[PDB]
């Protein structure tokens, strides 16, 4: 039983402009593997255990949108990514259809572009767990949350 802490987020907040600049300048998570500042960032949590590597790549990749793109808000349960993107009001549901139909690296890319455009508020550990698994049910649940919230706030 090993969980990635929320400390990562805090670390990302506290990290210098240089390394964050190196990280933001990235197209794909493998190119995130390419840069050293990433390894220096993600070691404590950590990177040296392959069970965690994919999850860390996704999480850090999403955070790489910007220092204050993903806004953490404490909670019964906190606001989910679907609810967040829906509350933002800037996102069109078709692009989320795209997101659910995307494959491998592409989806993450599509996800990042959304975050930058959304400036969402959400409970970071939830998004962290969903990125940890990112199965079919995470996708489906994301779309469900978005559609239901948008339908409930129209």
């Amino acid at each position: 039983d090993e969980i990635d802490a929320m400390a990562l987020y805090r670390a990302w907040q506290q990290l210098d402009n240089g390394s964050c600049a190196q990280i933001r300048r990235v197209s794909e998570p493998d190119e995130l593997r390419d840069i050293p500042a990433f390894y220096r960032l993600v070691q404590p949590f950590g990177w040296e255990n392959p069970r965690h590597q994919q999850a860390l790549l996704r999480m850090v990749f999403c955070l790489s949108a910007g220092k204050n793109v993903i806004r953490h808000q404490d909670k019964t349960t906190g606001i989910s990514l679907g609810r967040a993107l829906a509350n933002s009001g800037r996102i069109n549901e078709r692009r989320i259809f795209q997101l659910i139909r995307a494959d491998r690296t592409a989806d993450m890319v599509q996800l990042r572009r959304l975050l930058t455009h959304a400036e969402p508020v959400l409970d970071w550990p939830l998004m962290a767990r969903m990125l940890t698994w990112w199965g079919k049910r995470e996708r489906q649940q994301l779309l469900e949350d978005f559609v239901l919230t948008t339908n409930k706030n129209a």
């Binding site: 069109n92 795209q98 139909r101 995307a102």
Partner: protein, 363 residues
């Protein structure tokens, strides 16, 4: 092996939207656990019926409708100089089961394919009621004996002889039931597809340039695999005992259409007018689809086309050797390849392939 003729087509399409959902999304289907873009077989069929090539080489397509109130006017226009209006009304009334009132709008049970030739024929046959009066059920019993005589008039149909029809009401439920004769599959892509979205706007000349919410149109390119199959005997029967050679000519027309015709959906704005890159035809005692050649979604090496051709040829070799099939098999490809094996004869042009079909695979 010479009753069924199998048509396989590999055709690559540039970015387009050839068939839509109820949400205006690209029709899709899951094959081998992977998403494939799909084109409806009904779409291909109608695309063929309403094509110019069909009009030039096969003839006039059937008129499918429920509106008998318009159909009576059409039939009165095209058959008025040959028959009396009351006779035509009684004819259409007998065939459909509804009554021709001279009203504004009376509808049928469902969409029905009508060919004017067989209707004229039924006018001639119901003109025998102008003779020594037979009861309509009597006349029906008379017509029941010789169905071939009715199917001879279906040479002005053919699309009905190919795709069949079903009647629920009228006299057509007992005289117009056509079963065969062409089995066509839904065109699916040989590979996994992530559909793109066109985010468009509409500039208002009296307000724009200004802000606006955007519209979406799902589109995608892809290498499609079309399959068709013709039961020659059933076609001959459907045309009233027509000769085999005739059925083979029609078959060649089907080959050409399946190789060239593309559904006109979104073509004004996307224009994916691409010819087939491969067309193989093989005669067999039993229908055979090579869809399982793409059960494992082909992955792009230099595009999706070449590995699709390659996979197709490999799977054809495996199946052919495994089940000991002996055609009557010919392949036409645009690309230079390493295909095999004898005697799946390579045809340099499409017309040579069609000619090879006309001469019953021996040419």
């Amino acid at each position: 092996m010479s009753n069924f003729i199998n048509i396989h087509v590999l055709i690559s399409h540039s970015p387009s939207c050839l068939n839509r959902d109820d949400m205006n999304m690209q029709k899709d289907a899951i094959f081998g656990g992977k998403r494939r873009v799909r084109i409806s077989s009904q779409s291909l069929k109608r695309a063929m019926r309403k094509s110019g090539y069909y009009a030039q080489n096969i003839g006039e397509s059937s008129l499918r409708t429920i509106h008998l109130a318009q159909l009576r006017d059409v039939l009165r226009q095209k058959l008025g100089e040959r028959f009396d209006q009351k006779i035509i009304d009684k004819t259409l009334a007998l065939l459909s089961g509804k009554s021709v009132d001279e009203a504004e709008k009376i509808s049928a049970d469902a969409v029905t394919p009508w060919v004017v030739g067989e209707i004229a024929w039924f006018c001639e046959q119901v003109a025998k009621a102008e003779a020594d009066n037979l009861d309509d059920k009597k006349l029906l019993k008379v017509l029941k004996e010789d169905i071939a005589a009715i199917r001879v008039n279906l040479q002005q149909g053919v699309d009905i002889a190919l795709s069949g029809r079903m009647a629920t009401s009228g006299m057509m439920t007992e005289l117009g039931k056509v079963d065969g004769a062409m089995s066509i599959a839904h065109a699916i892509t040989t590979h996994q597809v992530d559909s793109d979205i066109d985010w468009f706007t509409a500039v208002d000349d009296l307000q724009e340039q200004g802000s606006a919410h955007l519209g979406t149109q799902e589109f995608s390119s892809g290498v499609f695999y079309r399959y068709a199959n013709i039961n020659l005997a059933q076609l001959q029967e459907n045309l009233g005992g027509a000769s085999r050679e005739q059925a083979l000519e029609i078959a060649t027309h089907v080959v050409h259409m399946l190789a060239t015709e593309v559904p006109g959906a979104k073509q004004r704005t996307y224009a994916a007018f691409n010819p087939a890159d491969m067309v193989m035809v093989n005669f067999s005692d039993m229908p055979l689809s090579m869809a399982n050649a793409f059960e494992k979604a082909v992955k792009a090496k230099d595009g999706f086309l070449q590995p699709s051709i390659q996979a197709f040829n490999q799977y054809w070799d495996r199946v052919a050797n495994g089940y000991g099939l002996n055609g009557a098999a010919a392949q036409f490809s645009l690309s230079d390849v390493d295909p095999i094996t004898a005697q799946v004869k390579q045809m340099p042009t499409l017309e040579q392939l069609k000619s090879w079909v006309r001469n019953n695979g021996e040419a």
